[PDB]
Amino acid sequence: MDPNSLMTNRLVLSGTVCRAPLRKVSPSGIPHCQFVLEHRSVQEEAGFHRQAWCQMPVIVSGHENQAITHSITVGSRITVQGFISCHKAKNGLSKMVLHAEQIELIDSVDKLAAALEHHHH
Amino acid sequence: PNSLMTNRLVLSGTVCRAPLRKVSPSGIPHCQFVLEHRSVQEEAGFHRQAWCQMPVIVSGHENQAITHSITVGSRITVQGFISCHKAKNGLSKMVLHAEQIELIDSVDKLAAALEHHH
DNA sequence: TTTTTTTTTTTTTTT
């Protein structure tokens, strides 16, 4: 445990996905799926509050977590968690991306069900 | 402020540029710098590499104290939220607003004083 | 394995 003496970086962002999961599989047979999460919130800074809006291009790679994505529709309310990585050198400016290791959905069943059975009788 | 909406980034690395310390016409001291992260990771044994220069701002009186101590080369960890503005040309910029700092220099300084206090 | 240049209706924060 020597270099991990400055390798700590975890981002936890909840948000609604605005770009559907674009799946692909790289040569080694690994499957990955991207999308753009839109996060919006009120954040307090300096004893006051201000809005925090951001589009985070997240991507989930490898087997374990592919399933949970096949289940994330557009306008999904999710919280993703994993490391951040980026780059924008003037010889190929790529972008900031949250490689995800973990995701749980944030709209409760009792919640959504409400909006599926009520209009009727 | 509870609910779904949660934004927490906890980055570490070596302060690249600055820090530029200004007090703005609103009253508060603002300290801005850029943090250069570099690390290797992923679950079991698949090797991914990580790098990123996160513009950081430390806004308010509360945290400007610990600040007069970080300079280019300074290693620290910061925790706070990420917001994204327009820029001066390129649309969205990302900035981590630090709500909590950690000079990992004091970490070594504390581990040492332990290993060596006869 | 070149920090796998991978922003694919008007570029989501400007309705």
Amino acid at B89: N
DSSP A24-58: EEETTTEEEEEEEEEEEEEEEETTEEEEEEEEEEE
Query: Which one of B41, B53, B58 would you mutate to disrupt binding with A, by most A Cβ within 10 Å of its Cβ?
Result: B41
SS3 of chain A: helix, strand, coil, percent, to 5? 10, 55, 35
| Å separating the CA of residue B49 from the C1' of nucleotide C1 | 12
The DSSP code sequence of B3-31 is SS--EEEEEEEEE-S--EEEE-TTS-EEE
- Beta partners for A50? A43
Residues of B in contact with A62 (CB under 8 A): 42-43, 46
Helix (H) or strand (E) holding B82: strand B75-85
- CB-based contact B9 A7, cutoff 8 Å: no
Handedness of CA B38, B49, B42, A76 (dihedral sign): positive
- Report the SS3 class of residue A109: helix
Nearest one of A22, A20, A17 to A76, comparing CA atoms = A17
Q: What's at B67, amino acid-wise?
A: T
CATH code: domain of residue A62:
2.40.50.140
A61 CA, C11 C1': separation in Å?
27
What is the spatial distance between Cα A8 and Cα A82, in angstroms, rounded to a whole number?
11
Instruction: To the nearest 10°, report the CA torsion of B20, B24, B29, B33.
Output: -20
Sign of CA dihedral A111, A39, B19, B71: positive
Tokens of B10: 């906890």
Give the residue nearest to nucleotide C8 (CA to C1'): A22
A88 touches strand C (CB under 7 A): no
A32: how many CB neighbours lie within 10 A of its CB? 18
Quote the number of domains for chain B. Answer: 1
Is the Cβ–Cβ distance between A11 and A98 less than 8 Å? yes
Q: Check: CB of residue A73 under 8 Å from CB of residue A55.
A: no
CA distance A21 to A109: 22
Experimental method: X-ray
**A22 CB below 7 A from strand C atoms:** yes
Q: Which residue's structure tokens are 């999961």?
A: A21
φ, ψ (nearest 5 deg) of residue B109: -55, -30
Given B39, B84, B104, which is nearest A54 (Cβ)?
B84
Q: Give A84's contacts (C-beta < 8 A, 6+ positions apart).
A: A9, A11, A96, A97, A98, A99, B9, B11, B37, B50, B52, B54
- Chain A residues with at least one Cβ partner in B under 8 Å: 3-15, 39-47, 50-55, 62, 64, 77, 79, 83-87, 96, 99, 101, 106
How many whole angstroms from its chain centre is CA A55? Answer: 9
CA A58 to chain centre: 5
**Structural contact between residues A33 and A59, judged by C-beta atoms closer than 8 angstroms:** yes
A42 touches strand C (CB under 7 A): no
**Separation of CA A107 from chain center:** 15
Question: Which positions in chain B touch A4 (Cβ < 8 Å)?
Answer: 39
Residues in chain B: 118
In this complex, the answer to whether residue B2 has its CB under 7 A from any atom of chain C, a nucleic strand, is no
Structural domain span for residue B87: 1-118
Distance CA B86, CA A42 (A): 18
- Count Cα neighbours of A10 within 13 Å in the Cβ-side half-sphere: 9
CB–CB contact A7 B99 (8 Å): no
Sort out which chain A residues have CB atoms less than 8 A from B99's CB and list them: 45
Q: Which helix (H) or strand (E) holds B101?
A: strand B93-103
Alpha-carbon span B55 to B32, nearest angstrom: 7
Q: Alpha-carbon distance B16 to B118, whole Å?
A: 37
Q: What is the experimental resolution, given in Å to one decimal place?
A: 2.7
